[PDB]
Structure formats: structure tokens, C-alpha cells
Enzyme design. Structure first.
Site, PDB file in Angstrom:
ATOM      1  N   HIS A 109      38.247  29.382  33.934  1.00 24.08           N
ATOM      2  CA  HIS A 109      39.638  29.141  34.318  1.00 24.08           C
ATOM      3  C   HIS A 109      40.074  27.765  33.821  1.00 24.08           C
ATOM      4  CE1 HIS A 109      43.064  28.999  37.418  1.00 24.08           C
ATOM      5  NE2 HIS A 109      42.904  27.719  37.102  1.00 24.08           N
ATOM      6  N   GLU A 110      39.276  26.740  34.130  1.00 25.66           N
ATOM      7  CA  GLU A 110      39.685  25.387  33.788  1.00 25.66           C
ATOM      8  C   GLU A 110      39.637  25.158  32.282  1.00 25.66           C
ATOM      9  OE1 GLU A 110      41.106  23.064  35.648  1.00 25.66           O
ATOM     10  OE2 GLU A 110      41.142  24.418  37.344  1.00 25.66           O
ATOM     11  N   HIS A 141      42.750  26.304  30.692  1.00 26.75           N
ATOM     12  CA  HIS A 141      43.883  25.380  30.689  1.00 26.75           C
ATOM     13  C   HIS A 141      43.908  24.565  29.399  1.00 26.75           C
ATOM     14  CE1 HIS A 141      45.671  26.088  34.574  1.00 26.75           C
ATOM     15  NE2 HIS A 141      44.609  25.694  35.257  1.00 26.75           N
ATOM     16  N   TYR A 168      53.249  22.818  34.050  1.00 30.80           N
ATOM     17  CA  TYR A 168      52.441  23.094  35.227  1.00 30.80           C
ATOM     18  C   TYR A 168      53.334  23.167  36.480  1.00 30.80           C
ATOM     19  CZ  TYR A 168      47.915  22.475  32.557  1.00 30.80           C
ATOM     20  OH  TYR A 168      46.848  22.617  31.681  1.00 30.80           O
ATOM     21  N   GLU A 227      48.676  29.248  35.433  1.00 26.25           N
ATOM     22  CA  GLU A 227      47.600  29.553  36.370  1.00 26.25           C
ATOM     23  C   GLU A 227      47.051  30.969  36.173  1.00 26.25           C
ATOM     24  OE1 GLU A 227      45.670  28.456  38.916  1.00 26.25           O
ATOM     25  OE2 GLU A 227      46.146  26.654  37.747  1.00 26.25           O
ATOM     26  N   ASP A 259      34.135  40.679  39.002  1.00 31.04           N
ATOM     27  CA  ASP A 259      35.076  41.167  39.991  1.00 31.04           C
ATOM     28  C   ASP A 259      36.428  40.616  39.583  1.00 31.04           C
ATOM     29  OD1 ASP A 259      35.251  38.411  41.116  1.00 31.04           O
ATOM     30  OD2 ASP A 259      33.129  38.919  41.461  1.00 31.04           O
ATOM     31  N   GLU A 305      38.266  38.844  41.726  1.00 29.57           N
ATOM     32  CA  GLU A 305      38.458  37.750  42.661  1.00 29.57           C
ATOM     33  C   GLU A 305      38.227  36.433  41.926  1.00 29.57           C
ATOM     34  OE1 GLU A 305      39.223  38.539  45.973  1.00 29.57           O
ATOM     35  OE2 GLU A 305      39.463  40.461  44.941  1.00 29.57           O
ATOM     36  N   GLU A 359      34.734  33.366  44.095  1.00 29.30           N
ATOM     37  CA  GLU A 359      33.925  33.956  45.157  1.00 29.30           C
ATOM     38  C   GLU A 359      32.509  33.395  45.220  1.00 29.30           C
ATOM     39  OE1 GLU A 359      35.171  35.549  42.495  1.00 29.30           O
ATOM     40  OE2 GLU A 359      33.307  35.937  41.371  1.00 29.30           O
ATOM     41  N   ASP A 380      52.811  22.711  45.975  1.00 33.24           N
ATOM     42  CA  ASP A 380      51.957  23.272  44.925  1.00 33.24           C
ATOM     43  C   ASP A 380      52.719  23.379  43.608  1.00 33.24           C
ATOM     44  OD1 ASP A 380      49.690  24.457  43.730  1.00 33.24           O
ATOM     45  OD2 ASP A 380      50.290  26.489  44.372  1.00 33.24           O
ATOM     46  N   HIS A 405      49.817  28.207  42.165  1.00 37.98           N
ATOM     47  CA  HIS A 405      48.646  28.990  42.526  1.00 37.98           C
ATOM     48  C   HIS A 405      48.987  30.164  43.439  1.00 37.98           C
ATOM     49  CE1 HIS A 405      46.792  25.040  41.496  1.00 37.98           C
ATOM     50  NE2 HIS A 405      45.779  25.773  41.066  1.00 37.98           N
TER      51      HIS A 405
HETATM   52  O1  LIG Z   1      37.197  45.014  41.465  1.00 42.11           O
HETATM   53  C1  LIG Z   1      38.205  45.960  41.906  1.00 42.11           C
HETATM   54  C2  LIG Z   1      38.272  45.947  43.385  1.00 42.11           C
HETATM   55  O2  LIG Z   1      38.991  44.774  43.812  1.00 42.11           O
HETATM   56  C3  LIG Z   1      38.973  47.153  43.946  1.00 42.11           C
HETATM   57  O3  LIG Z   1      38.920  47.076  45.307  1.00 42.11           O
HETATM   58  O4  LIG Z   1      38.306  48.400  43.485  1.00 42.11           O
HETATM   59  C4  LIG Z   1      38.418  48.479  42.025  1.00 42.11           C
HETATM   60  C5  LIG Z   1      37.832  47.267  41.306  1.00 42.11           C
HETATM   61  O5  LIG Z   1      38.269  47.277  39.916  1.00 42.11           O
HETATM   62 CA   LIG Z   2      32.474  32.747  50.698  1.00 38.42          CA
HETATM   63 CA   LIG Z   3      35.381  36.176  40.073  1.00 31.97          CA
HETATM   64 ZN   LIG Z   4      47.555  24.937  44.057  1.00 29.24          ZN
HETATM   65 ZN   LIG Z   5      32.098  37.454  40.575  1.00 31.46          ZN
HETATM   66 ZN   LIG Z   6      44.278  26.258  37.189  1.00 31.61          ZN
HETATM   67 ZN   LIG Z   7      42.277  23.817  38.624  1.00 31.88          ZN
HETATM   68 ZN   LIG Z   8      44.260  24.881  40.217  1.00 32.00          ZN
END
Ligand SMILES: O[C@@H]1[C@@H](O)[C@H](O)OC[C@H]1O
Ligand SMILES: [Ca+2]
Ligand SMILES: [Ca+2]
Ligand SMILES: [Zn+2]
Ligand SMILES: [Zn+2]
Ligand SMILES: [Zn+2]
Ligand SMILES: [Zn+2]
Ligand SMILES: [Zn+2]
Ligand SMILES: O[C@@H]1[C@@H](O)[C@H](O)OC[C@H]1O
Ligand SMILES: O[C@@H]1[C@@H](O)[C@H](O)OC[C@H]1O
Ligand SMILES: O[C@@H]1[C@@H](O)[C@H](O)OC[C@H]1O
Ligand SMILES: O[C@@H]1[C@@H](O)[C@H](O)OC[C@H]1O
Ligand SMILES: O[C@@H]1[C@@H](O)[C@H](O)OC[C@H]1O
Ligand SMILES: O[C@@H]1[C@@H](O)[C@H](O)OC[C@H]1O
Ligand SMILES: [Cl-]
Ligand SMILES: [Cl-]
Ligand SMILES: [Cl-]
Ligand SMILES: [Cl-]
Ligand SMILES: [Zn+2]
Ligand SMILES: [Zn+2]
Ligand SMILES: [Zn+2]
EC number: 3.4.24.27
Length: 316
Positions: A142-143, A146, A157, A166, A185, A187, A190, A226, A231
Site C-alpha cells: 500500500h505505502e 503511494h 492527498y 488511498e 484476502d 481486508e 489484518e 482525515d 481513508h
Molecule cells: O475475500 C472475500 C470475502 O471477503 C467474502 O466474504 O467472500 C468472498 C471473498 O472473495
Molecule cells: Ca486483529
Molecule cells: Ca490483506
Molecule cells: Zn486516515
Molecule cells: Zn491477508
Molecule cells: Zn495510504
Molecule cells: Zn499510510
Molecule cells: Zn494512510
């Protein structure tokens, strides 16, 4: 430093063993000569002086707890380099094989990681909100993304442009996590967020509302915190990207998923060819549609799915 290219071994923040590219000259240094102009990882020694000392180790074994953030910063910078080179033909973050420099053990109890314009900086976290943040490949990528944005579109930004900035970083952070294909995933963060709580994250791309972030333009944040919600409002674009890749039905709009590789190609082309510093959500839609048209043709499923996904999140 000048020396022999070697391969060490150690464990990362989450206890996993991995090999790291090092350089030997009396000590073994976290200096990977195999990627561009090099990947260099540094010990900030709990100070805020940067970059600190190039990381030196006596035996090329990196299993001490103090070593773990450095192992992961170094290794995941390498993965991110490999992703951009192998998938997008991009050599390092500037496309000209700039050295990738990272400092770990920055400050004390520091719950953040950031690209500072010339290097990566990783706090160790306070052990409750975060563990050392280089343990999260999506945070690392992610960073570093940027930096890619800074060297291409230059998205500011703040406000909608900043939320796109972002989301771009979340999208490629996630695509790097899948490219590494260890524990991917949709997310963010995590692996390093809240070690006492399983199953959470900083934010969700598949379901932004799980953490109170908007999943539709009509729910966008319009306040001043923010930097205007960069974000927060990223959830609107993150959800569109998730839909483009995985498909789904969202606020009654059905999206045919086209998969991760095409998601990445479309957004990479949008970022590098079409976005500008003040692109807004509508202009991002247009850029993604034009990018998909360039790559797949105006009558393609890929173009139709881009349109469906932005429709689903209310971006016209
Ligand atoms: O990772 C995803 C998940 O967040 C979702 O709940 O089920 C499908 C997946 O692609
Ligand atoms: Ca955790
Ligand atoms: Ca992740
Ligand atoms: Zn933020
Ligand atoms: Zn992961
Ligand atoms: Zn960022
Ligand atoms: Zn950042
Ligand atoms: Zn950030
Ligand atoms: O130490 C050497 C490094 O400085 C150079 O850049 O490429 C080869 C390495 O062995
Ligand atoms: O999972 C993705 C893979 O499918 C594609 O080949 O390139 C990008 C990766 O994230
Ligand atoms: O239902 C969600 C709620 O659980 C959370 O507290 O705030 C955001 C909502 O999307
Ligand atoms: O107007 C929007 C509507 O079109 C969509 O279905 O869900 C959110 C609303 O704000
Ligand atoms: O207030 C801004 C809003 O107008 C825009 O739509 O999204 C970003 C916010 O900062
Ligand atoms: O405004 C941009 C437009 O000029 C281009 O054609 O596609 C990207 C858009 O955002
Ligand atoms: Cl969902
Ligand atoms: Cl949803
Ligand atoms: Cl869905
Ligand atoms: Cl829904
Ligand atoms: Zn050692
Ligand atoms: Zn939905
Ligand atoms: Zn959904």
C-alpha cells in the site's frame, strides 16, 4: 556497501521463516543486489533519525525478535518489486529502478508506517493496536504504491482525489498480497492489526460498511477530518474494485467479475495513463472505462463490468 551477494534466513513478525538477500562484507547486511538498484533495510534504533544504520548481522541468520521487522520490510519490498516488474513491467516505484530503502524500529510504540517521499518507515506498534507494521504485506505494498502514484498521476492527498489515492494503494496492496499468495484476502492490515482480536482489520474492500466506511457515493463523508475522509471514502472505490474482480450484486446492481489480473491491468493503466492530480470519482470511472476499452475493446465484458461496478457504488 560493496560485498558478495548472499542469501540469509530468518523469521518475520508473524513467526514465518523466509530467505532474504543480503550482502557480505565482514557483516551480513540487509542489502539485496538482485532487484534494480538494490533493496536496503535499515535499523532506526527506536529513534526518528532516518534512515539509520544499514542493517548488519554477524551470521546471516535473522531469527531474533529484534530482527523480525527488518526481515519482513526487506522481504516484502522484494515481493512488491517483483509484482510491479513481473505483472506491470514497472521497474521499482519510479519505473527507473530506484533503490528501495526501508527503516524499521522507528520511534517507540509508533502505530503507523509510511512512505516519506524517499523511503519506507515502519513503527513497531504499541503491541495492542499494532504489532510491527512491516509484518503486513498489504501495508508494505500500500505505502510503496503511494510512491508509484506520486511518480505517475500525482493524485493529491485530500477529498475525492485523496480517497482515490488511498483506494489505489489498497487495491495494489491487496493484489500484491494475492501475488505473494500466502494468506490473501480483501481486508487491509489484518496481519498486524489488533493481535488480541482475530478476524478484524483496518478496513474491508469486500464490505466497507463492516467498519462503518461508505460502500456507495450517497454515503460519502463530507467533513474535514482525515483530509476530507481519504481513508473513509476509499471504501467506495475499494468496493467497486472488489466487484470488478470478484463480481456480486450490490444495491441491486449485478456485476460480472473478471478476476484480479484484469482488475490490476485496468487500474494500473488508469493510474499511469489517464489520472491527474485532481481526478475525482467520476473521472476515475471514465479512466477505468477507457483503460478497459484500450485493453479489451469497447464491446468487451471487461468494459461492461467496469461500468456495472461503478454503477453499483453510485459513481456516474
Ligand atoms: O475475500 C472475500 C470475502 O471477503 C467474502 O466474504 O467472500 C468472498 C471473498 O472473495
Ligand atoms: Ca486483529
Ligand atoms: Ca490483506
Ligand atoms: Zn486516515
Ligand atoms: Zn491477508
Ligand atoms: Zn495510504
Ligand atoms: Zn499510510
Ligand atoms: Zn494512510
Ligand atoms: O556489493 C555489490 C553492490 O554494491 C553492487 O551494486 O552490485 C553487486 C554487489 O555484490
Ligand atoms: O492474483 C493476481 C493474479 O491472478 C494475477 O496473475 O496478477 C495479479 C495477482 O494479484
Ligand atoms: O452495521 C455497521 C455497524 O455495525 C457499525 O457499527 O457502523 C457501520 C455499520 O455499517
Ligand atoms: O440514490 C441511491 C440509489 O440509486 C441506490 O440504490 O442506493 C443509494 C441511493 O443513495
Ligand atoms: O467533502 C468532500 C466531498 O465533496 C467529496 O465528494 O468527497 C470528499 C470529501 O472530502
Ligand atoms: O478526464 C480523463 C479523460 O481525459 C480520459 O479520456 O480518460 C480518463 C478521464 O478521467
Ligand atoms: Cl458483500
Ligand atoms: Cl455490501
Ligand atoms: Cl458482493
Ligand atoms: Cl448490497
Ligand atoms: Zn544473526
Ligand atoms: Zn453490497
Ligand atoms: Zn458485496
Amino acid at each position: 556497501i560493496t560485498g558478495t551477494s548472499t542469501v540469509g534466513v530468518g523469521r518475520g513478525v508473524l513467526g514465518d521463516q523466509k530467505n532474504i538477500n543480503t550482502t557480505y562484507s565482514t557483516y551480513y547486511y540487509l542489502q539485496d543486489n538482485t532487484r534494480g538498484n538494490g533493496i536496503f533495510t535499515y535499523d532506526a534504533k527506536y529513534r526518528t533519525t532516518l534512515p539509520g544504520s544499514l542493517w548488519a548481522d554477524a551470521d546471516n541468520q535473522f531469527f531474533a525478535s529484534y530482527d523480525a521487522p527488518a526481515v519482513d520490510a526487506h522481504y516484502y519490498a522484494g515481493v512488491t518489486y517483483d509484482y510491479y516488474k513481473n505483472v506491470h513491467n514497472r521497474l521499482s516505484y519510479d519505473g527507473n529502478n530506484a533503490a528501495i530503502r526501508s527503516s524499521v524500529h522507528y520511534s517507540q510504540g509508533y502505530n503507523n508506517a509510511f512512505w516519506n517521499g524517499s523511503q519506507m518507515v515502519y513503527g513497531d506498534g504499541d503491541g495492542q493496536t499494532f504489532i510491527p507494521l512491516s509484518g503486513g504485506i498489504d501495508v508494505v505494498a500500500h505505502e510503496l504504491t503511494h510512491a508509484v502514484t506520486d511518480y505517475t498521476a500525482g493524485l493529491i492527498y485530500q477529498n475525492e482525489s485523496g480517497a482515490i489515492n488511498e483506494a489505489i494503494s489498497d487495491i495494489f496492496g491487496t493484489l500484491v498480497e494475492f501475488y505473494a499468495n500466502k494468506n490473501p484476502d480483501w481486508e487491509i492490515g489484518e496481519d498486524v492489526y489488533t493481535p488480541g482480536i482475530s478476524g478484524d482489520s483496518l478496513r474491508s474492500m469486500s464490505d466497507p460498511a463492516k467498519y462503518g466506511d461508505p460502500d456507495h457515493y450517497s454515503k460519502r463523508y463530507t467533513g474535514t477530518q482525515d483530509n476530507g475522509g481519504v481513508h473513509i471514502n476509499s471504501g467506495i472505490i475499494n468496493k467497486a474494485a472488489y466487484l470488478i474482480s470478484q463480481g456480486g450484486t450490490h444495491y441491486g446492481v449485478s456485476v460480472v467479475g473478471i478476476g484480479r489480473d484484469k482488475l490490476g491491468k485496468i487500474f494500473y493503466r488508469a493510474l499511469t495513463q489517464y489520472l491527474t492530480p485532481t481526478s475525482n470519482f467520476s473521472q476515475l470511472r471514465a479512466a477505468a472505462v477507457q483503460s478497459a476499452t484500450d485493453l479489451y475493446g469497447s464491446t468487451s465484458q471487461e468494459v461492461a463490468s467496469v461500468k456495472q461496478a461503478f454503477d453499483a457504488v453510485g459513481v456516474k
